[PDB]
Design a protein around this nucleic acid. Structure first.
Ligand SMILES: [Cl-]
Ligand SMILES: [Cl-]
Ligand SMILES: [Cl-]
Ligand SMILES: [Cl-]
Ligand SMILES: [K+]
Ligand SMILES: [Mg+2]
Ligand SMILES: [Mg+2]
Ligand SMILES: [Mg+2]
Ligand SMILES: [Mg+2]
Ligand SMILES: [Mg+2]
Ligand SMILES: [Mg+2]
Ligand SMILES: [Mg+2]
Ligand SMILES: [Mg+2]
Ligand SMILES: [Mg+2]
Ligand SMILES: [Mg+2]
Ligand SMILES: [Mg+2]
Ligand SMILES: [Mg+2]
Ligand SMILES: [Mg+2]
Ligand SMILES: [Mg+2]
Ligand SMILES: [Mg+2]
Ligand SMILES: [Mg+2]
Ligand SMILES: [Mg+2]
Ligand code: NA
Ligand code: NA
Ligand code: NA
Ligand code: NA
Ligand code: NA
Ligand code: NA
Ligand code: NA
Ligand code: NA
Ligand SMILES: [Sr+2]
Ligand SMILES: [Sr+2]
Ligand SMILES: [Sr+2]
Ligand SMILES: [Sr+2]
Ligand SMILES: [Sr+2]
Ligand SMILES: [Sr+2]
Ligand SMILES: [Sr+2]
Ligand SMILES: [Sr+2]
Ligand SMILES: [Sr+2]
Ligand SMILES: [Sr+2]
Ligand SMILES: [Sr+2]
Ligand SMILES: [Sr+2]
Ligand SMILES: [Sr+2]
Ligand SMILES: [Sr+2]
Ligand SMILES: [Sr+2]
Lengths: 194, 237, 56, 92
RNA sequence: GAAACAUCUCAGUAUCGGGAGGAACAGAAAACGCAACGUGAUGUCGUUAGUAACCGCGAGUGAACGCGAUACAGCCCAAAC
RNA sequence: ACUCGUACGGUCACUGAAUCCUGCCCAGUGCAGGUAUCUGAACACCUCGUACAAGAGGACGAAGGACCUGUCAACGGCGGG
RNA sequence: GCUUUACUGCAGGCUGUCGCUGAGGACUCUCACUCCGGGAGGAGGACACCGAUAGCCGGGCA
């Protein structure tokens, strides 16, 4: 039979329809008055959280982050630039808003490590994402056969080096064949052409 | 070129800033709940460095020493009342609804409870004209008919220090002293006397503007100089 | 007044001093920032890639 | 100059002389789906677009004859080398 | 550089911000597509090749599959119950 | 920032104490107001096209422009016969 | 370096359109959102702000 989780999932397929439309209209009013990074006890999308790796355990933290909507907040050139490099308005950043959210969260919690994240909607001026962070130093996690990999030294600051799922997708690493010639094993090894 | 003088202004540097640390008080109306039982005695009449007009020092019934925007004919010993049921006397503050038509008023609020925005300079006044349940039409010092909320407070009488503009400065030194008390860079060098690099009207073998002086509203800062969006120019016609 | 020799006489102000962090006479006693190591500006030591030739 | 609307001349299709009809080549409308149209969309970004930033040039004082010679029996057309003519009017 | 120059080129170079390790990153196919009755995670080396592809179709720019090597290693969740 | 400011304000320009004065010109350029009609992009909408799409056309039409008016202590002009 | 009715572009301003954005070719409302108010509450209101795109102006700048 269907899980209770499948209903949270099916509601989030259309966040502008049904009971969720009313819920988000109410929640966003409280969210707009909240901070940049707000730690929350329980995830808004349980299915997605659990699907991404969350467990109702010690050392597993969730936090909602709001990042501004739109393109790059670019300053115009103060020196000589050829016509091609004179733009301000149409320039967009190479990192997506989800990745900016994950980084801001990881900085608010220096000891924790980013596991994953997901979208929880937007209004006209900003976007909200909930980031699942993990405590690599808590024994409740060092003994977890499903999460203890994040405790390794090489997993330190994993988000800033693009090792998150959102990191790997934004780096163009999804495709294993055609189209990923300049992306795998890294953008840097391929001369920054990805 | 180089940024024009009006552009250096917005950066808010020392040269363009007002000497706020030498200023006395932010002349706002008192916060009363409802009851009118707030009145006070005028203790002193001081000079306000920010507006070059006098300001009255009032001590209220509850023990609050605040500087208020002084109208004409207000002295030491005089009692001033602030509230809804206040007396229609010069120097009293009450909402526009309670003030009768045809009475000169000053320190008028824009949105009820802001503390006064309009008619604050030396000798000027706002004229209260029409009454309604919804709107109070006030004629501001510029001659404009401002439709306001009747719950907007205002002080009865014309502002003190009238006729200041009547006497000439005579000499540059007097202007210097007035300007040292304001948020203004003075003296003024004409753009026509500058280099092309410094102003749109700069350059030339003789002094005259480049293009015509009447500039469009859509003009960017650095080009918006001369006669900004002029409907007309000159005296005749 | 000339910008050269006669303007050098007014120079009796102390700005750059011995730094607590690096030991260089670059701690600006008015800015409270070291021009050499960045003490007072950053926790990280001031270093730049242009302090050496590009391929070195 | 004056040009006869219908006249006897060679047909490279029929391989014999037939009565041809002369018509001025009417410009066929563009689809906007050729490679050059797709390149105009792709190679245009911030600043100058190179070749796509150029505007159409001038005109020669006199253009050549742009004509179609349509066969009377087989109904197929052929193109010929044009000649400089300030005006080209047809007879009948 | 294009014997000017704007796209292009120099170059994702210089330089700047953030961060890990002793190495990093990548990685067990929603792959490939010598189309196959075929291959079988990933880096890297040789080659494929200055080939395909791009380009005021100018100057210039420029892969990959495959192959020969190196080394080889596959696994864990979410959900169902 | 102006601004502990509010039109007797303060911003932007021109001229340059006082005294006597400051003519004519709105065609061009600028600014501003208006505008039946004309022109005027994209989205959505309608027709054609495509089992879809590219694409072609139509309808509607903002500011702007055409057009009209105001304005020279606005740029300036004040001749030849 | 500087100028402009040089070429090409880039900011900026104006304007339409989409998102935020809701209820009953012009209109009413209040629930988002904005502002005023210490507060109660008041003004405004699906507009404005902001994100995106389109047309016009655009030596202010390259
Ligand atoms: Cl992290
Ligand atoms: Cl003054
Ligand atoms: Cl012809
Ligand atoms: Cl194969
Ligand atoms: K260049
Ligand atoms: Mg590598
Ligand atoms: Mg005040
Ligand atoms: Mg004056
Ligand atoms: Mg000063
Ligand atoms: Mg002057
Ligand atoms: Mg000079
Ligand atoms: Mg000179
Ligand atoms: Mg200039
Ligand atoms: Mg002169
Ligand atoms: Mg002059
Ligand atoms: Mg060259
Ligand atoms: Mg050439
Ligand atoms: Mg290249
Ligand atoms: Mg391939
Ligand atoms: Mg002079
Ligand atoms: Mg506020
Ligand atoms: Mg220039
Ligand atoms: Na962290
Ligand atoms: Na790319
Ligand atoms: Na492309
Ligand atoms: Na050359
Ligand atoms: Na040159
Ligand atoms: Na090119
Ligand atoms: Na004129
Ligand atoms: Na020079
Ligand atoms: Sr760290
Ligand atoms: Sr206040
Ligand atoms: Sr105030
Ligand atoms: Sr000049
Ligand atoms: Sr006149
Ligand atoms: Sr001197
Ligand atoms: Sr000194
Ligand atoms: Sr500092
Ligand atoms: Sr450094
Ligand atoms: Sr493109
Ligand atoms: Sr372009
Ligand atoms: Sr010609
Ligand atoms: Sr293998
Ligand atoms: Sr005079
Ligand atoms: Sr005119």
């Amino acid at each position: 039979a269907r899980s209770a989780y499948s209903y949270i999932r099916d509601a989030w397929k259309n966040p502008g329809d049904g009971q969720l439309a009313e819920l988000q209209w109410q929640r966003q009013q409280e969210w707009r008055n909240e901070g940049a990074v707000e730690r929350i006890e329980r995830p808004t999308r349980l299915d997605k959280a659990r699907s991404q790796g969350y467990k109702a355990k010690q050392g597993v933290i969730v936090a909602r982050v709001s990042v501004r909507k739109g393109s790059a907040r670019k300053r115009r050139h103060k020196a000589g630039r050829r016509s091609k490099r004179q733009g301000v308005t149409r320039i967009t950043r190479r990192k997506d808003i989800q990745r900016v959210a994950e980084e801001r969260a990881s900085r608010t919690f220096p000891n924790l490590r980013v596991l994953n994240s997901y979208s929880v909607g937007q209004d006209g001026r900003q976007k909200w994402h909930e980031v699942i962070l993990i405590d690599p130093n808590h024994p409740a996690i060092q003994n977890d056969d499903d999460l203890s990999w994040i405790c390794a030294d090489d997993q330190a600051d994993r988000v800033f080096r693009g090792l998150t799922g959102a990191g790997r997708r934004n780096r163009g690493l999804s495709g294993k064949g055609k189209g990923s010639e300049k992306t795998r094993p890294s953008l840097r090894s391929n001369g920054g052409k990805g | 070129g180089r940024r024009i003088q009006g552009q250096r202004r917005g950066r808010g540097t020392s040269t363009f800033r007002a000497p706020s640390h030498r200023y006395k008080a932010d002349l706002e109306h008192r916060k009363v709940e409802d009851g009118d039982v707030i009145a006070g005695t005028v203790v002193d009449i001081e000079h306000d460095p920010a507006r070059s007009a006098p300001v009255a020092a009032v001590e209220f019934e509850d023990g609050d020493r605040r500087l208020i925007l002084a109208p004409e004919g207000v002295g030491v010993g005089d009692e001033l009342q602030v509230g809804v049921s206040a007396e229609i006397a010069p120097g009293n503050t009450l909402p526009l609804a309670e003030i009768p038509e045809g009475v000169p008023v000053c320190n008028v609020e824009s949105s009820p409870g802001d503390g006064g925005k309009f008619a604050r300079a030396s000798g000027v006044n706002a004229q209260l004209l029409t009454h309604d349940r919804n709107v109070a039409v006030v004629k501001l010092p510029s001659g404009e008919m401002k439709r306001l909320d009747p719950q907007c407070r205002a002080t009865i009488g014309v502002v003190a220090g009238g006729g200041r503009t009547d006497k000439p400065f005579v000499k540059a030194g007097n202007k210097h002293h007035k300007m040292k008390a304001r948020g203004t860079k003075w003296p003024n060098v004409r753009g026509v006397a500058m280099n092309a690099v410094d102003h749109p009207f700069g350059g030339g073998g003789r002094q005259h503007p480049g293009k015509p002086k009447s500039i469009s509203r859509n003009a960017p800062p650095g080009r918006k100089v001369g006669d900004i969006a002029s409907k007309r120019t000159g005296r005749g016609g | 007044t000339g910008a050269g020799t006669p303007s050098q006489g007014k120079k009796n102000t102390t700005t750059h001093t011995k730094c607590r962090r690096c030991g260089e006479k670059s701690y600006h006693t008015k800015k409270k920032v070291c021009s050499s190591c960045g003490f007072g500006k950053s926790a990280k030591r001031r270093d730049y890639e242009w302090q050496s030739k590009a391929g070195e | 100059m004056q040009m006869p609307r219908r006249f006897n001349t060679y047909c490279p299709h029929c391989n014999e002389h037939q009565e041809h009809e002369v018509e001025k080549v009417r410009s066929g409308r563009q689809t906007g789906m050729k490679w050059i149209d797709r390149q105009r969309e792709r190679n245009s970004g911030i600043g100058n677009d190179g070749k796509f930033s150029k505007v159409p040039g001038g005109d020669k004082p006199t253009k050549k004859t742009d004509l179609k010679y349509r066969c009377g029996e087989c109904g197929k057309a052929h193109l010929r080398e044009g000649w400089r003519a300030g005006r080209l009017e047809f007879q009948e």
